[PDB]
Amino acid sequence: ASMETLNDLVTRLEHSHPNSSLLKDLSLIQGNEQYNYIKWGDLSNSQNLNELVFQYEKAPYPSITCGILTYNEERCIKRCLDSLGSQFDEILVLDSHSTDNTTKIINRDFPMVKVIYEPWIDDFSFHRNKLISLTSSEWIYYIDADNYCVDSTNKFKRVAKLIQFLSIDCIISPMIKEHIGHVYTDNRKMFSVKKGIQFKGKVHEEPINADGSIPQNITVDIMICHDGYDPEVINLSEKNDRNIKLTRQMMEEEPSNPKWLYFYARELHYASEDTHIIETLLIKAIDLYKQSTYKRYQPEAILLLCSILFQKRQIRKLNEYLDLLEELQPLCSDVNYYRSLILFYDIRLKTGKLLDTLKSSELENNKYSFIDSSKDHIKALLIELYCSIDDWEGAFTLFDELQSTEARNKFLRRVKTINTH
Amino acid sequence: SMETLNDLVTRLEHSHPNSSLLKDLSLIQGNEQYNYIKWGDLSNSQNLNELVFQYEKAPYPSITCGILTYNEERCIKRCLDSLGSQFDEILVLDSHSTDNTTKIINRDFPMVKVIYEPWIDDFSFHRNKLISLTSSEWIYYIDADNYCVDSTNKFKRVAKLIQFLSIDCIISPMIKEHIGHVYTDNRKMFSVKKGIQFKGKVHEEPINADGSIPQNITVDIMICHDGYDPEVINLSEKNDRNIKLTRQMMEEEPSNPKWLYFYARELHYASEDTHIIETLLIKAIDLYKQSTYKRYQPEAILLLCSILFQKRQIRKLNEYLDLLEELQPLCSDVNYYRSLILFYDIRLKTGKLLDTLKSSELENNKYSFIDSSKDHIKALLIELYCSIDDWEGAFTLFDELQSTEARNKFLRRVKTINTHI
Ligand SMILES: O=c1ccn([C@@H]2O[C@H](COP(=O)(O)OP(=O)(O)O[C@H]3O[C@H](CO)[C@@H](O)[C@H](O)[C@H]3F)[C@@H](O)[C@H]2O)c(=O)[nH]1
Ligand SMILES: O=c1ccn([C@@H]2O[C@H](COP(=O)(O)OP(=O)(O)O[C@H]3O[C@H](CO)[C@@H](O)[C@H](O)[C@H]3F)[C@@H](O)[C@H]2O)c(=O)[nH]1
Numbered sequence: 001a002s003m004e005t006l007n008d009l010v011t012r013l014e015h016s017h018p019n020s021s022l023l024k025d026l027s028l029i030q031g032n033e034q035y036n037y038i039k040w041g042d043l044s045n046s047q048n049l050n051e052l053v054f055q056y057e058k059a060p061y062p063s064i065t066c067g068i069l070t071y072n073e074e075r076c077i078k079r080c081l082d083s084l085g086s087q088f089d090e091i092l093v094l095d096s097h098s099t100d101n102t103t104k105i106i107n108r109d110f111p112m113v114k115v116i117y118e119p120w121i122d123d124f125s126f127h128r129n130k131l132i133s134l135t136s137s138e139w140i141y142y143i144d145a146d147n148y149c150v151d152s153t154n155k156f157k158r159v160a161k162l163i164q165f166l167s168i169d170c171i172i173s174p175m176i177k178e179h180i181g182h183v184y185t186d187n188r189k190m191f192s193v194k195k196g197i198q199f200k201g202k203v204h205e206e207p208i209n210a211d212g213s214i215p216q217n218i219t220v221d222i223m224i225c226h227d228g229y230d231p232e233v234i235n236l237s238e239k240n241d242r243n244i245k246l247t248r249q250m251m252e253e254e255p256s257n258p259k260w261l262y263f264y265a266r267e268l269h270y271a272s273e274d275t276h277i278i279e280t281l282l283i284k285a286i287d288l289y290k291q292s293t294y295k296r297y298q299p300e301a302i303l304l305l306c307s308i309l310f311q312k313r314q315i316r317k318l319n320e321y322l323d324l325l326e327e328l329q330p331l332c333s334d335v336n337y338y339r340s341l342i343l344f345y346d347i348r349l350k351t352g353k354l355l356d357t358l359k360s361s362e363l364e365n366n367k368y369s370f371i372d373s374s375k376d377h378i379k380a381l382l383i384e385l386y387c388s389i390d391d392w393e394g395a396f397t398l399f400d401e402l403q404s405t406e407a408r409n410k411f412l413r414r415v416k417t418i419n420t421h
Numbered sequence: 422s423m424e425t426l427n428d429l430v431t432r433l434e435h436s437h438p439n440s441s442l443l444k445d446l447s448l449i450q451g452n453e454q455y456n457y458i459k460w461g462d463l464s465n466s467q468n469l470n471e472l473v474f475q476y477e478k479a480p481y482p483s484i485t486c487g488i489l490t491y492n493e494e495r496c497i498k499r500c501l502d503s504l505g506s507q508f509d510e511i512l513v514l515d516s517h518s519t520d521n522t523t524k525i526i527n528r529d530f531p532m533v534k535v536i537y538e539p540w541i542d543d544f545s546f547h548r549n550k551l552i553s554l555t556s557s558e559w560i561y562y563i564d565a566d567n568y569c570v571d572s573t574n575k576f577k578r579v580a581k582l583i584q585f586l587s588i589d590c591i592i593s594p595m596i597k598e599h600i601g602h603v604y605t606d607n608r609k610m611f612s613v614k615k616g617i618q619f620k621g622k623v624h625e626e627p628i629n630a631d632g633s634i635p636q637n638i639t640v641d642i643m644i645c646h647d648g649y650d651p652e653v654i655n656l657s658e659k660n661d662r663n664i665k666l667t668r669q670m671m672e673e674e675p676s677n678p679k680w681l682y683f684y685a686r687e688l689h690y691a692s693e694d695t696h697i698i699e700t701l702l703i704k705a706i707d708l709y710k711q712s713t714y715k716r717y718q719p720e721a722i723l724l725l726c727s728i729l730f731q732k733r734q735i736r737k738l739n740e741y742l743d744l745l746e747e748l749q750p751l752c753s754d755v756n757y758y759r760s761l762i763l764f765y766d767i768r769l770k771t772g773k774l775l776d777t778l779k780s781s782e783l784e785n786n787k788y789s790f791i792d793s794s795k796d797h798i799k800a801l802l803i804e805l806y807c808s809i810d811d812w813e814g815a816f817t818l819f820d821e822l823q824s825t826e827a828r829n830k831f832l833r834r835v836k837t838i839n840t841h842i
């Protein structure tokens with residue numbers, strides 16, 4: 001009863017059965033090489049592998065309930081429901097007594113959907129834990145009313161079947177694409193309801209194991225869209241205020257929990273509040289993380305602080321927090337991202353000083369050339385320096401001053417390419 | 422009592438802003454150099470009044486315009502038309518043109534006198550023969566591929582002024598090449614009463630009767646030249662002519678650096694071995710040490726510098742920049758080259774930064790908590806590409822971006838660039 005990774009199993013099947021349902025389901029799991037499973041024999045024996053593949057073939061699909069919180073979502077509720085298809089065995093909408101057409105649109109166009117009511121009490125976990133309560137299926141998947149699936153393809157059913165069949169203990173995250181096109185992978189939206197999992201936290205809630213441990217998240221190749229942060233459609237300030245209210249509530253409940261300090265900092269940052277207050281909150285959070293087994297968001301907190309420190313040019317302090325992050329997360333790309341930002345800033349600074357020194361040492365200061373009386377060669381070098389530091393206005397300005405054809409070409413060439421290309 | 426031409430200009434700018442004297446003085450560029458003898462005290466408004474009226478009243482010296490021609494049917498009329506009726510005598514010395522050159526002159530310009538003299542590979546001999554044939558006080562030389570922009574009687578005025586103030590010099594109009602570059606030390610106009618003679622078979626120049634090198638004064642007269650326009654002229658043919666005559670001068674006057682500079686320059690135009698050119702120029706610069714003749718040394722040093730910069734011999738380049746600074750403290754080209762060195766090193770740094778980031782962080786199991794797609798890193802690389810003027814690389818990565826927040830900076834650059842057209 002050996003154990004190997006999902007990726008190891010993938011390899012075998014990519015030789016043995018490239019059209020097996022098992023391989024097709026496995027390849028929905030991202031980061032396959034993480035995560036282990038237990039085999040019940042020698043799978044390099046082609047008979048045993050055929051029996052595994054065939055046993056997956058005829059295994060049942062777990063039942064899955066889709067749970068949806070609603071409050072005043074007439075804008076998008078139909079978009080949401082239509083995107084789900086017919087995968088799910090049940091669709092519960094827990095509505096907080098909407099005064100728009102939300103429930104009318106549901107009753108009218110979606111008679112299969114069950115609508116339950118529960119008044120809002122400023123606790124996302126309470127509402128989501130109520131949906132768990134009402135679920136008949138083996139699994140739940142949560143989608144929000146301002147979300148919609150692109151490529152349904154029965155992938156929810158398939159993922160549930162695979163995870164259950166291979167006895168993997170986890171929460172499942174689809175990918176969630178914001179309206180700007182940025183994709184989030186740690187969402188924690190789909191799990192079995194038979195293990196005593198409960199959400200905790202009034203906002204920025206997450207699923208917690210019944211023993212209080214933090215479950216492993218596995219991201220799957222299912223794309224969900226969101227427009228809840230699109231300023232053309234919604235009042236971003238209203239939601240930022242909702243989040244601040246509930247985050248503050250959570251801080252009062254759970255001081256010394258760094259999670260809420262980070263989110264408080266993050267929300268004040270969206271509202272363009274005093275960065276020194278944000279800075280102090282993040283420093284306190286990072287310090288609190290050291291008392292905590294809970295590590296989620298520590299990287300994100302360090303990186304928000306970094307963004308502020310870089311902006312304030314506190315390079316020494318910034319490097320100390322990058323070093324800390326490098327230690328906590330050896331393979332995190334963001335460290336060298338920031339190390340690179342520091343280097344580039346200094347490069348542009350050096351360039352700017354060179355430009356200024358040249359300009360004002362031969363600012364027509366009587367001094368004479370032997371290469372060009374018009375000093376167009378110096379002007380042309382200054383132009384290159386301007387483009388180098390992304391000061392195109394200064395470039396265009398001095399370009400107009402050029403009294404030549406050879407001097408003008410280098411810039412004209414470059415400009416032509418941009419318009420066309 | 423003696424003072425500068427600039428001093429007289431100052432006095433007159435207050436007293437007599439419409440005097441001929443001041444109008445004529447202002448044709449002289451670099452007035453602050455050069456001196457003259459006042460006759461007493463010009464802070465007296467009557468003395469100055471008399472000087473002014475004396476100048477108003479003084480005669481214009483006679484000027485002959487001398488032109489060498491060989492097969493200039495293309496441009497001889499453009500040339501003669503541009504001269505106007507200024508001159509007291511126009512002499513063409515023709516080397517037995519086979520084209521229509523002299524027919525055009527005799528048909529369309531009957532007052533012009535045409536003399537013939539077989540070409541003997543010696544520009545000085547031909548120019549001195551023009552001196553012999555001159556009836557005026559002054560000679561001004563123009564070539565057949567030259568044409569005055571706007572006469573304005575400036576030649577007669579310059580001659581009047583220089584003679585009235587007893588200034589000992591050669592006169593240079595400004596000569597503007599087809600590319601748009603202006604040369605100021607051409608040495609084309611002087612009195613034929615002082616035993617001046619041209620020397621050198623090519624790149625010839627006027628020499629005082631005692632062997633000394635006259636002072637050059639540039640005047641605000643624009644002359645155009647298209648004799649280096651490859652559209653119209655066979656440059657290689659002209660280059661071969663000059664190398665031949667230049668080699669003859671090196672045999673006559675070895676150890677005269679002038680001819681080493683010109684031989685190097687000509688071999689360079691013809692893309693000959695840069696090591697040979699370098700060796701010639703180093704030799705020339707070393708011969709300058711032995712000579713009071715300093716003309717073309719700055720140009721020799723700068724040609725060498727161009728070559729050394731191209732070969733990336735930065736230490737040697739800096740020695741020759743330091744020499745040029747010691748010789749020409751106020752020459753702008755030293756700082757130009759010092760800036761080129763620093764800009765090149767900066768771009769190298771930027772290039773290595775780009776290469777290091779891209780190779781360590783893209784597509785290789787390192788992860789981000791900022792953006793899982795790594796578009797923030799790609800966005801920074803795009804910035805680096807633009808900084809070093811590699812837009813094609815920038816365009817390529819730009820297309821990989823999925824976030825519009827990531828796209829924004831490059832889009833606005835390009836958008837703002839676009840509106841400037
Ligand atoms: O009083 C209320 C307010 C909202 N709702 C519903 O709950 C869902 C919450 O998502 P909403 O779009 O409002 O919050 P958002 O900031 O976009 O979501 C994140 O933040 C949420 C809160 O942490 C999280 O649940 C979500 O998954 C994140 F993406 C949505 O479908 C609302 O209709 C409600 O029923 N009653
Ligand atoms: O065999 C010949 C060849 C040319 N000529 C004439 O001499 C003049 C100068 O020649 P050209 O303009 O071709 O020489 P270029 O290289 O442009 O002039 C420089 O180089 C010249 C050579 O030092 C210098 O005189 C000139 O002022 C510089 F700008 C021009 O008007 C020709 O028609 C000639 O009469 N017999």
Ligand SMILES: [Mg+2]
Nearest residue numbers: 144146226228
């Ligand atoms: Mg939402």
Ligand SMILES: [Mg+2]
Nearest residue numbers: 564566646648
């Ligand atoms: Mg010419």
